[PDB]
Design a protein around this ligand. Structure first.
Ligand code: CL
Length: 548
């Protein structure tokens, strides 16, 4: 619903009679798992290309030599495919461009627009200056082209140890823009690269790789977050001073800032490494893997991204919007079922023992989704919460001598509560009114309707009740001497054993989603569900409990 300024930019080109296909890219570093914030970038880059029949590349920004790239490459590809998108052509890797990048660096040296600098980090930082205090030229800035070429070649050949010298662009140490103050282009690092192995011991900087990768790929619209807005002059400087094959243009959008959420790599790691969650794909984690395992649908995430739009204004999005999105999608699309979370045995005293009625309940109140068969008979389970000896005001379920409707079934009456030696109710003996199937009793009213399952045929199962991992809107903000862990929601997970699902749920497959009557929306966990024995995660409650 909200405006998307990039959509309007592309449409204006069309309105002006321009027919060039758009080419976007999603360019993550393969060094972390994606989170919900990345879904906005994914929906933006792939979605724009889809909308206008262009291309979106997947590019791994793998310029850094690291050991565990493949783990992250695989996970990132799986998230993108799960969201339903497809990159055009082959997967791209920034490391594929190392030869060309090095060639272009030599061109800058030859044009007197780059130099080899020997300054150590202390001097390098001191010479850099600040936004208010202008920097100083490196003492090596006036090296000859010949000397720069020789030193750079010797860097590439592996002559010097890590950090001994770097190649820098020669721009302006007095620039009000820090990125134009002779930025580093190459550093020495003797390290094995996941793609190119031991071939390189010089590696290019983010800025030297970024726009040049875009040009090589023929990117038309290079989309990044506002964090890199002040990099645009440098992005443009390289394109203006290199014989690049294309002139991609950079656009910046405001990142997704959800409340109640942590997305920072270091805090996520601590949550995982210290056992606050089960792993990176814990249903409470803001990872895309976590969101999937929670039961969110790709539709709900794409719908949410569409709803918040794309703009250049920083601002917080309430996580209730995302919770609404999955609520809305599952309300419309998910089959209904009954699962008794806290079972209480019920005996229908005037129901003939050994007899059964096979009631048929629609899987959806509106869609043509078939029926579930619910055997009704003498032995049932209801939720223990739906009977009270001493009811609170407004209570609408079972009380002693009182009635309740069983969903899609009969009106029953609580006639005797059986208690154990400790005073716990272990059985509720009820009568039913055989004239009430699909009919209200004549001359009296029944206040409430509850879910229920047959005792014989119910599926025993584990149900995990999930809620927000954090209980405050800005969890990273803590009191003096505290941390973000102080804001953890102690009620974020409740594991229930011995729940009683209707028989039809015995045929649930991993990732099947349901509305559990009067309880919420649930998914059969993709890892722990096995045939005949689902394990259910609560995806979201029926209605908002947190407010805003
Ligand atoms: Cl860098």
């Amino acid at each position: 619903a909200a405006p998307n300024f990039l959509r309007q930019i592309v449409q204006a080109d069309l309105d002006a009679g321009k027919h060039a296909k758009i080419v976007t890219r999603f360019p993550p570093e393969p060094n972390g798992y994606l989170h919900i914030g990345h879904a906005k970038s994914i929906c933006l880059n792939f979605g724009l290309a889809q909308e206008f029949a262009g291309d979106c590349h997947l590019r791994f920004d793998d310029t850094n030599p690291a050991k565990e790239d493949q783990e992250y490459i695989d996970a990132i590809e799986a998230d993108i495919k799960w969201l339903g998108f497809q990159w055009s052509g082959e997967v791209c890797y920034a490391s594929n461009y190392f030869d060309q990048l090095h060639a272009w660096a030599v061109e800058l040296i030859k044009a007197g627009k780059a130099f080899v600098c020997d300054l150590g980090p202390e001097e390098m930082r001191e010479y850099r200056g600040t936004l208010t205090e202008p920097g100083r030229n490196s003492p090596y800035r006036d090296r000859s082209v010949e000397e720069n070429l020789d030193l750079f070649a010797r860097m590439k050949a592996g002559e010097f140890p890590d950090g001994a010298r770097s190649l820098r662009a020669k721009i302006d140490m007095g620039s009000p823009n820090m990125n134009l103050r002779d930025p580093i282009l190459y550093r020495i690092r003797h390290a094995h690269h996941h793609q190119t192995g031991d071939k390189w011991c010089i590696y290019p900087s983010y800025d030297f790789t970024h726009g040049q990768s875009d040009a090589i790929e023929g990117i038309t619209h290079s989309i990044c977050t506002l964090e890199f807005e002040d990099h645009r002059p440098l992005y443009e400087w390289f394109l203006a001073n290199l014989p690049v094959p294309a002139q991609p243009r950079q656009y910046e959008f405001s990142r997704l800032n959800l409340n109640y959420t942590v997305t920072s790599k270091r805090k996520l790691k601590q949550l995982v490494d210290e056992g606050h969650v089960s792993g990176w794909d814990d249903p409470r984690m803001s990872t895309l893997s976590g969101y999937r395992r929670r039961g969110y649908t790709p539709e709900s995430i794409r719908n949410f991204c569409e709803m918040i739009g794309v703009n250049r204004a920083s601002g917080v999005v309430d996580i209730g919007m995302l919770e609404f999105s999955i609520r809305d999608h599952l309300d419309a699309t998910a089959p209904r079922a009954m699962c008794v979370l806290k079972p209480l045995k019920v005996v229908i005293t005037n129901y003939p023992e050994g007899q059964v009625e096979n009631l048929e309940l629609p899987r959806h109140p509106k869609e043509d989704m078939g029926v579930r068969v619910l055997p009704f008979g003498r032995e049932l389970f209801i939720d223990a919460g739906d009977f009270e000896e001493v009811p609170p005001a407004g209570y609408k379920r079972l009380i002693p001598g009182g009635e309740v409707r069983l969903r899609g079934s009969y009106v029953i009456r609580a006639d005797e509560a059986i208690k154990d030696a400790d005073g716990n109710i272990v059985e509720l003996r009820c009568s039913y009114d055989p004239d009430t199937l699909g009919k209200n009793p004549e001359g009296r009213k029944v206040k409430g309707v509850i879910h229920w399952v047959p005792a014989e045929g119910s599926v025993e199962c584990e149900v995990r009740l999930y809620d927000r991992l954090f209980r405050s809107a800005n969890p990273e903000k803590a009191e003096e001497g505290g941390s973000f862990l102080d804001n953890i929601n102690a009620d974020s997970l409740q594991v229930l054993a011995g729940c009683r699902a209707e028989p039809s749920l015995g045929q649930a497959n991993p990732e099947d989603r349901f509305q559990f009557e009067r309880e919420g929306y649930f998914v059969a966990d993709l890892k722990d569900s096995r045939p005949g024995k689902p394990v259910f995660n609560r995806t979201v409650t029926l209605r908002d409990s947190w407010g805003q």
